[PDB]
Write a protein that binds this ligand. Structure first.
Ligand code: CLA
Ligand code: CLA
Ligand code: CLA
Ligand code: CLA
Ligand code: CLA
Ligand code: CLA
Ligand code: CLA
Ligand code: CLA
Ligand SMILES: CC1=CCCC(C)(C)[C@H]1/C=C/C(C)=C/C=C/C(C)=C/C=C/C=C(C)/C=C/C=C(C)/C=C/C1=C(C)CCCC1(C)C
Ligand SMILES: CCCCCCCCCCCCO[C@H]1O[C@H](CO)[C@@H](O[C@H]2O[C@H](CO)[C@@H](O)[C@H](O)[C@H]2O)[C@H](O)[C@H]1O
Ligand SMILES: CC1=C(C/C=C(\C)CCC[C@H](C)CCC[C@H](C)CCCC(C)C)C(=O)c2ccccc2C1=O
Ligand code: SF4
Lengths: 138, 30, 80, 90, 161, 42, 732, 107
């Protein structure tokens, strides 16, 4: 669950932050824990200083949150970060890491989506599947 | 030369063609 | 949303998952390769179409393939 | 996709042998190779003779030689049909 | 003569071109003192212009109504030196060049690291190769007939059709 | 002659420049001593 | 958002890309949601009806605007001095001097001077007054309404045709060859004999008297007797004044050849026998295929049976029948290629052999007609190759085409593209080398050192047609040749009189500049063919992208991986080949216009001396003929060319605008639009107003297309303004 | 006021000697627009001997600069602390490079 009462990193503000679509369509949240107070670069442009302990941040896009996660992973060795999706109705959807284990590591219970049982050169030509709802993969 | 009545007749035929074109466009649009 | 497919030429090197900026791919258990794992795309609604995964794939002609389709707010990379 | 229609009586005339089957000659499928060769020679002579009469063309050409000049291109198809029938056992 | 053109050695407009060039150089010559190096240079230019027009007029070149030599390239031997024989000279050189380059490529595949041979030329071996090109048609034809020039289609990479 | 200097001299740009200048010098001297060759003379 | 109702994926787009892509895919019916083949064919049939109605409405509008605002009744009386009016001007942004300067043609209101040549065409075919022009406009309005009603009717239930009707190749070929080509040509010959030739001889024929005014004094009795040569007796005299009975003949069918000595156009009796013969030949062609009565040829058997037994063509043409019948894009490519070839043929043959009275003296009209139809030809040929590439993407079945001719094209596509590249580089290297060589030797004061190759092959062809200029003395230029004695009694005097008179554009004299510009044209044709053929044959896949057929005919790229894949689709090959097509028609029209202006000025030696080097083209054609165009308006005044003087600059503007969509690419503009979205959202008194679609940058393919459109419009408008204003300033 | 400056002469090879135009003063060459003649007149150069000596000085300074480059990279390379003196560099380049240069040129 997303604790809304987590304090935010000390930032002086910028023009690069989230627009009206964040409060109207969807917004993203990233939390992480730091061992010390240290300066990081905002993914929207500018420098902010994260506090010692937990940090909660709001963004407009998932890619901005994951860019910040990659930055703090390769520059501060922080891997406990969690990314959530928040709707205007208040429903919070946990996004990353989805099952608690990072996607580059195999975890039990994961099912393959979009896997094709042949090589890419065995896809069908369009002329078989014109005027037909058969997929080009077979 | 051409008179006013002839131009009016051409305008009436063009309006008929406009109605037929609108009908064809509605038929093509399903 | 874009469509991401993983073909059975995948060797399970996990490079495409590490290259993904939008957390679209993940590694699942498999028996078709020596690494014992294959890439999968359960989250293609967040796929922007950047094809960093296709750049990262080391198998001769790519095992992971991105087909651009219907554009959404997430796929267009719109912060507005 | 949809079935491609043909007129009634269309058969498969694709060939990889020395000569095509006689069906490619249509209504002339039952004419022997000797008759084709004789008609080709006769058509060549009549077409060349009629053409040589109508090379000095005037404003009043003879209609009969004009019709007979069209046997000159006919003889080419006739000797091709003669070759086809000769290698078809006919 | 050919195509209604006239020989340059009897064309009056060819003479008009020569006279116009000579007067154009002479009016520049008029503004310099005799013995000055610009005067000698201009007189040498006049001599080259006269020698060029004289040489062109006695060569059997055909001149059009413009006053310039027109080349005939239909294969006739009476103008065989205008396109056919210089082209064969190119055909001598160019067939040389590619062949020696091809030879170097066949050498370069046999080295330990071919790409270093590609960027850093083996100068004695390259000089040997550029020496070899003087008999290139017969050597290339024997390479062709022995199956060492053309490779079969089943050993060449092709895209999916 | 140092072998490393010779190998540097054997590089593609140096040899390219030297060979193309050498060829240009052939064309220039041929046109200096035999100018205005529009044709092969008969 | 439900504007693109044919695409659910486009209709769910939240940005401005939805409107653009719905606009660009609106007529791409094959890609629509749930399109079936029968619905596809029926929509295509009705759309073809609508385009036919549009063509008829445009022609009726031309006829009406001439009958109302033209000077046709003045122009018929004095065709060689009165300037033809296209349509009237009513522009409220005009000042008074612009009103004064456009008041031409003998009328009291501002008018545009016609360049389309409709005056000469309508006058030649027998129209004389404004009344029949209006009646023709009414008839075409009625015909367009009839075709609109037919388009509606043939979509209604119990009238929608089946797929077997649409794919009936034999019936459609027989009916379109015998009736649409043959009987239409026979009826046009009938119109020429019955109406046009009597009106050319000063005797009025209309609907009120055409059943009582015989086209020939002997009537149809010589036709029914077999004494057809009576129709060849008493032709028009060389003293005949067109549109009058003075010097008129009584013949209706001749083959006199050459031109009428006054109009400088082809004899109308020759045109009537030509169209009669074309009708007879086409009806004979139109009885060839079997439809319902056993006799006739079968198309499938003809295609399958023509396999050469040596095996050099593989299986021959087996499977081409189903591939062609099932693919509308293969058919569209074949049709567009053939149409482009014949409109090129129209462009060459109509300037060389004009058929309309007094149009050979209308220099602006000839230039406009040639330029227009040649640009149409380039567009049609590019479209043919593009839609062939679409046929490879969407419709090509390899399994139905095993060892076919198409499969063998695909199996040696690399040889084809490599040899096209070789001949293109060959042509460009040596053509540019000769041009630059000539420039350098002319700049250094030695024009005698130029490389000037006489075009002896084409001069030999001209002599074979009877041109005695070059002294080749062969075929029709030989008085003892068997071809000369064969044709001496029928057509040789008129043809020899027309070909050996230097007063027309019949086989114009050619020199080294003509040689160089035809080899440049060959270079441009081969290079455009290289781009288009390479796009069509690599459309299904390449070494860089072997699964291209899974991605369709048009897509932006395959990402920066594998070295980078910019402009890899066949649509991108179309996009690159459009510039080369514009270049090729530019070179052709530059050559045509400069040669024809130098002949019309009586200064053909200027072209003969200046066309051998590029500086001659830049100075003596571009710079020299620009003077009346750039003086259409100046600080001293303005005249009637000013609009072209505007349009010229207009082209120079819009062409340049295309560059910005072709040089600058997407991400810069997308980030600027992010900044603009922030600016609008944060500005008071404007954030009360909100967009419904999110502003985004144009997509990559869309931006390529938009830059191409601005580029092409600038190309066309610049050259049209230049050619019309230059020809008007020098000659009109 | 009547002699066009020209400091480039071409060889006659393929007819390019036509580029040696009549620039006045009994001289043929390519007209130059770099303004060196006016600079040399402003500097007081009245003969071509002084221009020869200027060329020799330029060649010597080119050799000195290339030797200084070889020495100051390959033989005695300054440390990072030497380069990171902005105050000393500005003092020396303001007073010695621009200041003494302006003073000597005023002289
Ligand atoms: C565009 C087509 C075309 C082509 C391909 C040729 C080709 C040729 N012409 Mg030619 N010609 C043409 C059009 C053409 N011509 C036209 C339109 C004219 C009329 C102006 C002429 C008039 C013409 C003349 C007058 C002559 C040629 C000759 C030749 C031949 C000389 C080449 C050679 O050395 O072979 C010969 C050598 C070998 C085969 C082997 C040697 C190693 C060559 C086969 C010459 C010839 O020999 O005639 C056959 C010759 O005298 N041509
Ligand atoms: C070893 C030299 C060599 C040889 C024998 C070939 C052979 C061929 N090339 Mg190729 N090519 C080469 C070098 C070579 N290439 C290089 C260096 C380039 C880059 C500029 C190209 C670019 C190129 C293109 C773009 C095309 C060809 C084509 C062709 C084919 C037709 C001939 C042609 O158009 O030549 C023309 C050759 C050129 C325009 C480039 C030649 C560049 C120089 C002059 C050659 C290199 C000489 C080399 C430095 C000598 C060093 C050897 C020495 C150490 C001993 C043929 C298979 C064409 C084709 O597909 O036809 C079927 C074609 O379209 N080539
Ligand atoms: C592919 C095109 C092409 C062709 C066929 C030629 C052919 C020729 N050029 Mg040309 N040239 C070209 C491109 C071309 N050039 C280009 C692009 C330029 C501009 C850079 C020039 C600039 C140029 C000049 C300035 C001169 C030539 C000369 C020559 C002649 C060679 C004389 C020679 O070396 O004797 C060979 C002699 C031997 C002893 C061997 C020959 C007719 C020269 C000449 O004589 O003019 C007629 C000459 O002075 N050309
Ligand atoms: C004799 C009967 C007949 C006739 C006259 C036609 C006529 C036509 N059919 Mg057709 N059709 C027929 C029977 C017939 N059909 C049958 C039996 C079938 C079923 C098997 C079909 C199935 C069919 C389909 C499926 C389609 C047509 C279409 C068309 C139209 C083609 C577009 C057009 O106007 O081009 C006019 C063409 C010509 C006049 C001839 C070609 C002209 C060439 C280019 C040469 C002319 C050059 C000349 C010098 C120019 C001079 C003019 C200049 C002065 C301006 C045309 C009206 C198409 C269409 O548009 O549908 C509405 C279409 O999609 N037909
Ligand atoms: C490239 C052109 C071409 C070709 C090759 C053909 C070929 C053919 N067409 Mg075709 N056709 C064409 C163009 C063409 N057509 C065109 C342009 C049209 C329309 C304007 C038609 C319209 C058409 C129709 C309507 C029909 C054909 C048919 C045929 C086939 C009949 C073969 C035949 O006549 O043998 C017949 C054999 C002979 C004539 C041999 C001669 C018999 C004896 C030996 C004569 C000699 C007797 C004696 C020695 C002479 C002296 C006599 C004296 C005593 C009186 C044949 C495959 C027919 C068919 O079957 O469909 C496929 C058919 O019904 N065609
Ligand atoms: C009679 C000729 C003809 C016909 C029937 C078509 C018909 C078609 N073309 Mg084509 N085309 C033509 C001429 C023609 N074109 C020419 C002359 C060119 C060269 C300029 C092209 C270049 C071209 C390209 C590059 C493409 C098409 C495409 C299309 C398809 C969709 C058109 C669309 O959405 O535009 C709608 C346009 C508007 C509503 C604007 C008005 C459609 C089947 C497109 C397609 O979907 O094919 C895969 C495509 O990518 N064509
Ligand atoms: C004198 C001036 C001149 C100049 C500067 C050039 C310059 C050039 N020519 Mg060229 N040419 C000239 C005169 C000239 N040409 C004349 C007079 C002829 C008529 C004979 C030709 C015929 C010619 C051909 C046929 C070709 C060139 C090519 C080239 C370009 C590459 C050079 C080359 O061969 O690569 C060095 C050579 C190689 C890299 C490989 C060897 C390939 C050679 C050309 C094969 C020769 C032997 C072969 C069996 C003959 C086949 C020819 C056949 C198709 C008729 C280059 C820009 C080539 C080109 O443009 O490529 C597209 C080319 O294919 N030229
Ligand atoms: C004036 C402009 C120009 C020129 C010269 C070229 C030239 C070329 N284009 Mg091209 N192109 C252009 C504009 C131009 N393009 C534009 C605006 C477009 C639209 C985007 C295209 C689209 C296009 C496509 C789509 C294709 C080409 C192809 C080609 C090549 C073959 C055509 C040809 O004539 O070969 C002859 C080549 C030339 C005449 C080039 C000049 C050769 C020079 C003069 C040789 C001398 C070089 C010199 C010694 C270097 C010294 C410099 C050094 C001192 C620094 C050739 C390299 C095709 C190709 O690659 O075919 C193989 C191809 O597929 N182009
Ligand atoms: C790429 C694409 C993929 C698949 C689909 C696709 C549409 C097929 C394709 C697009 C393809 C392209 C567009 C194909 C279309 C291609 C081109 C335009 C074909 C041009 C043909 C010219 C013919 C052969 C004739 C000239 C006359 C000859 C017979 C004359 C000789 C003589 C005659 C009798 C009279 C006098 C002159 C002389 C010389 C004495
Ligand atoms: C065994 C069969 C032999 C050949 C039979 C067919 C031959 C051609 C028949 C043509 C049609 C019938 O022709 C019949 O009506 C024509 C039209 O009224 C007549 O033609 C007459 O009237 C025409 C109309 O004013 C005039 O243009 C003609 O000069 C005049 O001769 C024919 O004199 C008559 O014979
Ligand atoms: C300038 C530029 C823009 C900016 C263009 C903006 C977004 C569009 C401005 C057009 C305005 C909004 C309307 C123009 C109106 C037209 C004159 C007609 C349109 C209506 C007809 C189609 C009916 C891009 O978005 C772009 C994207 C990718 C590569 C290059 C570029 C690029 O160069
Ligand atoms: S630059 Fe544009 S076209 Fe090229 S690979 Fe990148 S996104 Fe694709």
């Amino acid at each position: 669950t997303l604790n809304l009462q987590i304090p935010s990193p000390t930032f002086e503000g910028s023009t690069g932050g989230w627009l009206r679509a964040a409060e109207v369509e969807e917004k993203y949240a990233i939390t992480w824990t730091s061992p010390k107070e240290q300066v990081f670069e905002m993914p929207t442009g500018g420098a902010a200083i994260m506090r010692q302990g937990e940090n909660l941040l709001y963004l407009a896009r998932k890619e901005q949150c994951l860019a910040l996660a990659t930055q703090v992973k390769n520059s501060f060795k922080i891997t406990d970060y969690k990314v959530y999706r928040i709707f205007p109705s208040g429903e919070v959807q946990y996004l990353h890491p989805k099952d608690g284990v990072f996607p580059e590591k195999v975890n039990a219970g994961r099912v393959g989506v979009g896997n094709v049982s042949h090589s890419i050169g065995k896809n069908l030509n369009p002329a078989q599947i014109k005027f037909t709802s058969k997929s080009f993969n077979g | 030369m051409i008179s006013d009545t002839q131009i009016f007749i051409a305008l009436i035929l063009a309006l008929v063609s406009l109605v037929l074109a609108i009908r064809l466009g509605r038929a093509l649009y399903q | 949303s874009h469509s991401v497919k993983v073909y059975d030429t995948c060797i399970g090197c996990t490079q495409c998952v590490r290259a993904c900026p939008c957390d679209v791919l993940e590694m699942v258990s498999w028996d078709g390769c020596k690494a014992g794992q294959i890439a999968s795309a359960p989250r293609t609604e967040d796929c922007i179409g950047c094809k960093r995964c296709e750049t990262a794939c080391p198998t001769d002609f790519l095992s992971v393939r991105v087909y651009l389709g219907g554009e959404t707010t997430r796929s267009m990379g719109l912060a507005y | 996709y949809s079935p491609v229609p043909s007129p009634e009586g269309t058969k498969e005339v694709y060939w990889e042998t020395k000569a095509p089957s006689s069906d490619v000659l249509g209504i002339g499928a039952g004419v022997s190779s000797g008759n084709f060769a004789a008609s080709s020679v006769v058509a060549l002579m009549i077409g060349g003779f009629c053409t040589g009469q109508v090379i000095p063309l005037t404003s009043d050409p003879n209609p009969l030689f004009l019709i007979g000049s069209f046997l000159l291109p006919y003889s080419w198809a006739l000797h091709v049909a003669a070759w086809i029938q000769k290698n078809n056992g006919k | 003569d050919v195509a209604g053109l006239t020989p340059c050695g009897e064309s009056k407009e060819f003479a008009r071109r020569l006279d116009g060039s000579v007067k154009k150089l002479q009016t520049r010559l008029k503004k310099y003192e005799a013995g000055t190096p610009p005067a000698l240079a201009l007189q040498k230019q006049i001599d080259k212009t006269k020698n060029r027009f004289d040489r062109y007029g006695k060569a059997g070149l055909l001149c059009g109504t413009d006053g310039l030599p027109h080349l005939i390239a239909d294969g006739r031997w009476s103008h065989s030196g205008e396109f056919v024989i210089p082209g064969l000279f190119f055909l001598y050189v160019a067939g040389w060049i590619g062949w020696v380059g091809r030879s170097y490529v066949l050498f370069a595949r046999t080295a330990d690291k071919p790409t270093e041979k590609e960027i850093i030329i083996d100068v004695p071996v390259a000089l040997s190769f550029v020496s070899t090109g003087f008999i290139w048609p017969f050597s290339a034809f024997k390479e062709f007939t022995s199956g060492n020039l053309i490779v079969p289609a089943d050993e060449i990479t092709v895209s999916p059709r | 002659m140092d072998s490393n200097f010779l190998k540097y001299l054997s590089t593609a740009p140096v040899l390219f420049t030297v060979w193309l200048s050498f060829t240009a010098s052939f064309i220039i001297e041929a046109n200096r001593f035999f100018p205005d060759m529009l044709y092969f003379p008969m | 958002t439900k504007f693109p109702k044919f695409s659910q994926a486009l209709a769910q787009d939240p940005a401005t890309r939805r409107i653009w892509y719905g606009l660009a895919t609106a007529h791409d019916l094959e890609s629509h949601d749930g399109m079936t083949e029968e619905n596809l064919y029926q929509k295509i049939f009705a759309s073809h009806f609508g385009h036919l109605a549009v063509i008829f409405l445009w022609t009726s509008g031309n006829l009406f605007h001439l009958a109302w605002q033209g000077n046709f009744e003045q122009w018929v009386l004095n065709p060689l001095k009165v300037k033809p009016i296209a349509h009237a001007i009513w522009d409220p942004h005009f000042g008074q001097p612009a009103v004064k300067a456009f008041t031409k043609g003998g009328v009291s209101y501002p008018v545009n001077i016609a360049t389309s040549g409709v005056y000469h065409w309508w006058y030649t075919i027998g129209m004389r007054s404004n009344t029949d022009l209006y009646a023709g406009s009414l008839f075409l309005l009625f015909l367009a309404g009839v075709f609109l009603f037919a388009g509606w009717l043939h979509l209604q239930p119990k009238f929608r045709p089946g797929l077997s009707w649409f794919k009936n190749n034999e019936s459609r070929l027989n009916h379109h060859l015998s009736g649409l080509f043959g009987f239409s040509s026979l009826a046009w010959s009938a119109h020429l004999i019955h109406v046009a030739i009597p009106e050319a001889r000063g005797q009025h024929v209309g609907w009120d008297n055409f059943t009582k005014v015989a086209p020939h004094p002997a009537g149809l009795q010589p036709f029914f007797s077999g004494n057809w040569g009576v129709y060849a007796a008493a032709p028009d005299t060389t003293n005949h004044i067109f549109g009058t009975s003075e010097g008129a003949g009584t013949a209706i069918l001749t083959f006199l050849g050459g031109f009428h000595p006054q109009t400088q156009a082809l004899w109308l009796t020759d045109i009537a026998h030509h169209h009669l013969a074309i009708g007879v030949v086409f009806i004979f062609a139109g009885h060839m295929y079997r439809t319902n009565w056993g006799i006739g040829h079968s198309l499938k058997e003809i295609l399958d049976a023509h396999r050469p037994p040596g095996g050099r063509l593989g299986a021959g043409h087996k499977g081409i029948f189903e591939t062609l019948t099932n693919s509308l894009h293969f058919q569209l490519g074949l049709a567009l290629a053939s149409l482009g070839v014949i409109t090129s043929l129209v462009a060459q043959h109509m300037y060389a052999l004009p058929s309309y009275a007094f149009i050979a003296k209308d220099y602006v009209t000839q230039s406009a007609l040639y330029t227009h139809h040649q640009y149409i030809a380039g567009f049609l040929m590019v479209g043919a190759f593009a839609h062939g590439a679409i046929f490879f993407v969407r419709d090509y079945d390899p399994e139905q085409n095993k060892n076919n001719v198409l499969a063998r094209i695909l199996d040696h596509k690399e040889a084809i593209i490599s040899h096209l590249s070789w001949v293109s580089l060959f042509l460009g290297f040596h053509t540019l080398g000769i041009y630059v060589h000539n420039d350098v030797v002319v700049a250094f004061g030695t024009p005698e050192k130029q490389i000037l190759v006489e075009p002896v092959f084409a001069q030999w062809i001209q002599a074979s047609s009877g041109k005695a200029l070059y002294g080749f003395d062969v075929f029709l230029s030989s008085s003892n040749s068997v071809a000369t004695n064969a044709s001496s009694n029928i057509w040789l005097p008129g043809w020899l009189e027309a070909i050996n008179s230097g007063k027309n554009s019949l086989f114009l004299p050619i020199g080294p500049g003509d040689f160089l510009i035809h080899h440049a044209i060959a270079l441009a044709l081969h290079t455009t063919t290289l781009i288009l053929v390479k796009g069509a044959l690599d459309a299904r896949g390449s070494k860089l992208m072997p699964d291209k057929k899974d991605f369709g005919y048009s897509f932006p790229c395959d990402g920066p991986g594998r070295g980078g894949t910019c402009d890899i689709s066949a649509w991108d090959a179309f996009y690159l080949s459009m510039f080369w097509m514009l270049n090729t028609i530019g070179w052709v029209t530059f050559y045509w216009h400069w040669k024809h202006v130098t002949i019309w000025q009586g200064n053909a030696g200027q072209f003969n001396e200046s066309s051998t080097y590029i500086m001659g083209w830049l100075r003596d054609y571009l710079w020299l003929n620009s003077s009346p165009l750039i003086n259409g308006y100046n600080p001293f005044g303005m005249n009637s060319l000013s609009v072209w003087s505007w349009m010229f600059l207009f082209g120079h503007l819009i062409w340049a605008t295309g560059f910005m969509f072709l040089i600058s690419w997407r991400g810069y503009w997308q980030e600027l639009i992010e900044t603009l979205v922030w600016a609008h959202e944060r500005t008071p008194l404007a954030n009360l107003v909100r967009w419904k679609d999110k502003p985004v940058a144009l997509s990559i393919v869309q931006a390529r297309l938009v830059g191409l459109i601005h580029f092409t419009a600038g190309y066309i408008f610049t050259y049209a303004a230049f050619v019309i204003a230059s020809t008007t300033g020098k000659f009109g | 006021t009547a002699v066009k400056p020209s400091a480039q002469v071409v060889w006659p090879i393929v007819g390019q000697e036509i580029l040696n135009g009549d620039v006045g003063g009994g001289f043929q060459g390519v007209q130059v627009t770099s303004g060196f003649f006016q600079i040399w007149r402003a500097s007081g150069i009245t003969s071509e001997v002084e221009l020869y000596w200027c060329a020799l000085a330029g060649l010597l300074m080119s050799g000195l600069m290339i030797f200084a480059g070889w020495f100051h990279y390959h033989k005695a390379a300054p440390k990072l602390e030497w380069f990171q003196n902005a105050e000393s560099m500005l003092n020396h380049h303001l007073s010695g490079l621009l200041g003494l240069g302006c003073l000597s040129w005023a002289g």
